[PDB]
Amino acid sequence: KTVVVTTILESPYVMMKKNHEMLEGNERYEGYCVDLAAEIAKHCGFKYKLTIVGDGKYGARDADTKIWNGMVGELVYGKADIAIAPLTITYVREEVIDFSKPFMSLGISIMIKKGTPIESAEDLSKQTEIAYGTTDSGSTKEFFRRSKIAVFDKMWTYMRSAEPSVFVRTTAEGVARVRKSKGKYAYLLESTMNEYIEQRKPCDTMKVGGNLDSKGYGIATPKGSSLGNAVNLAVLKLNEQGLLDKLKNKWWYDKGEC
Amino acid sequence: KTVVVTTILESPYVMMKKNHEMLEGNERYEGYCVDLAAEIAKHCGFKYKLTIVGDGKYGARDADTKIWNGMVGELVYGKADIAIAPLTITYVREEVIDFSKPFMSLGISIMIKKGTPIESAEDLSKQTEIAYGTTDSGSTKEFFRRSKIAVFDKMWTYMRSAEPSVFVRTTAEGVARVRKSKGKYAYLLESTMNEYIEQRKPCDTMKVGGNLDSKGYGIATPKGSSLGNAVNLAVLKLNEQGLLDKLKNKWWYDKGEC
Ligand SMILES: Cc1onc(O)c1C[C@H](N)C(=O)O
Ligand SMILES: Cc1onc(O)c1C[C@H](N)C(=O)O
Numbered sequence: 001k002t003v004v005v006t007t008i009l010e011s012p013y014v015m016m017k018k019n020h021e022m023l024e025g026n027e028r029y030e031g032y033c034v035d036l037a038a039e040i041a042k043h044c045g046f047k048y049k050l051t052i053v054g055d056g057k058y059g060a061r062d063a064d065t066k067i068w069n070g071m072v073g074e075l076v077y078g079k080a081d082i083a084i085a086p087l088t089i090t091y092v093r094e095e096v097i098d099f100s101k102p103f104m105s106l107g108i109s110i111m112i113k114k115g116t117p118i119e120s121a122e123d124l125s126k127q128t129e130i131a132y133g134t135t136d137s138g139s140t141k142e143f144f145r146r147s148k149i150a151v152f153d154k155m156w157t158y159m160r161s162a163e164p165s166v167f168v169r170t171t172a173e174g175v176a177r178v179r180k181s182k183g184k185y186a187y188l189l190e191s192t193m194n195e196y197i198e199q200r201k202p203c204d205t206m207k208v209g210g211n212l213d214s215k216g217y218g219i220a221t222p223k224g225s226s227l228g229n230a231v232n233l234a235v236l237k238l239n240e241q242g243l244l245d246k247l248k249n250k251w252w253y254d255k256g257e258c
Numbered sequence: 259k260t261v262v263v264t265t266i267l268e269s270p271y272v273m274m275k276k277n278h279e280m281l282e283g284n285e286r287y288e289g290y291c292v293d294l295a296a297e298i299a300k301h302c303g304f305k306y307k308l309t310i311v312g313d314g315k316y317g318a319r320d321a322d323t324k325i326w327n328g329m330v331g332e333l334v335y336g337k338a339d340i341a342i343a344p345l346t347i348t349y350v351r352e353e354v355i356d357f358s359k360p361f362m363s364l365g366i367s368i369m370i371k372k373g374t375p376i377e378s379a380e381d382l383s384k385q386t387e388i389a390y391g392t393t394d395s396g397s398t399k400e401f402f403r404r405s406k407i408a409v410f411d412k413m414w415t416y417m418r419s420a421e422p423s424v425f426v427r428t429t430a431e432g433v434a435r436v437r438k439s440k441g442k443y444a445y446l447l448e449s450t451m452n453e454y455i456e457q458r459k460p461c462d463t464m465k466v467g468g469n470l471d472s473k474g475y476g477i478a479t480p481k482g483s484s485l486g487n488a489v490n491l492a493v494l495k496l497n498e499q500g501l502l503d504k505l506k507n508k509w510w511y512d513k514g515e516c
Pocket of ligand 1: 010086088135137139140171189190
């Protein structure tokens with residue numbers, strides 16, 4: 001049976017090919033995760049269908065309804081068999097779904113419009129002029145909401161009450177906000193995305209400071225899935241073979257426009 | 259049931275405390291992994307006994323004899339219940355034992371005596387004047403043996419046949435060799451150790467170039483062990499709580515000497 005792969009439209013992980021309107025199925029997409037999915041499928045010997053997550057979210061549990069959304073929800077409720085995307089491995093997610101060992105390492109970082117007088121999370125927490133926020137329904141927002149660390153707690157206290165909302169629905173929306181805010185908005189997103197955008201026209205944004213944490217992305221499967229073991233080994237193999245490093249260079253720097 | 263923890267004497271992960279000769283049990287040791295064992299045990303609710311791996315090795319499968327040695331062997335043959343040490347998550351190991359998500363991220367790096375005219379792996383491969391090797395029975399040696407990447411394969415071809423042997427039994431042995439070879443020997447070891455040593459007297463070593471790969475250390479358990487799940491969630495919890503970062507800052511920086 002064809003394996004249903006849930007993923008998210010997030011450059012450069014999954015993107016629409018130039019002539020996608022003339023293409024069908026998996027041929028409509030290109031990107032790091034499109035390439036990765038092919039490698040994993042070949043190694044695990046299965047056929048698959050890439051499907052873009054319906055609500056366009058990574059995945060969080062509704063504190064009220066206790067219902068999971070995004071890619072996590074699609075796995076939890078049986079809509080998809082596996083998730084291949086820049087989905088972060090976290091405690092609350094590991095409680096409901098399985099994750100392979102990481103295929104990419106990263107951490108939350110700060111994106112600023114070049115020239116913005118900010119160099120750290122501490123800087124952001126101390127000032128009021130420059131607003132800052134994160135993407136909704138993901139591990140980054142949960143990071144600040146749950147942090148007991150002084151700096152991050154202060155930032156969360158501010159973000160949770162900010163008006164207008166400093167939270168964005170997608171990475172693209174956040175990038176646009178940084179670029180159009182004349183330096184009055186800083187965006188908290190993972191290092192992977194930050195460094196990617198840093199290499200794309202108009203080259204007006206940049207990553208400042210070190211990462212706030214260290215974590216990774218994992219391929220996810222519903223709890224008890226029979227695909228789990230083989231996928232985990234496939235990831236480890238592809239990494240040791242240097243394929244993952246090649247894919248990173250391919251989509252991040254070989255095509256860099258800055 | 260007292261959980262038997264197999265680990266290895268490797269500074270600053272596990273070290274004999276001053277006057278350990280008059281100490282007993284777990285109290286004889288100190289270090290990053292000693293602290294981690296305590297937190298993991300507390301979260302998983304178990305008592306444990308730290309034991310230093312008999313052959314002082316990380317773990318590899320002997321060709322021909324096909325028997326696993328080091329900490330991996332301890333787990334595989336039932337000598338230990340869990341391994342808490344700087345043990346790299348690898349494909350071949352994952353085939354015989356289980357690993358938690360990583361508690362530390364790192365990569366293979368190059369250590370040189372300060373002043374050595376080498377800045378990359380390519381440099382080492384492009385010459386023969388400066389010898390170079392890795393530690394025996396571990397992920398680093400296996401990395402070169404299996405790599406199909408031009409530079410690394412060329413390096414392996416040289417190392418496999420070099421005389422006298424460029425392979426060392428322990429990192430301390432590799433470090434001492436770099437320090438006493440007047441720049442005629444470079445050492446291939448993980449970034450964690452390289453960075454640690456660079457801040458220690460006689461402050462005569464340094465890391466050059468970026469890491470060759472990206473991987474992590476995981477807490478290992480016998481395949482199918484009941485401890486697997488709880489340990490994995492414990493590692494994720496501790497990382498998200500910021501404890502893993504505090505622990506590294508404590509054993510690498512707070513104590514740093516150069
Ligand atoms: C990608 C990405 O970049 N910044 C982020 O917060 C994310 C989403 C994050 N990886 C998640 O799984 O929620
Ligand atoms: C620690 C350490 O530092 N360099 C290395 O090769 C190692 C050993 C490596 N972590 C293993 O598991 O074999």
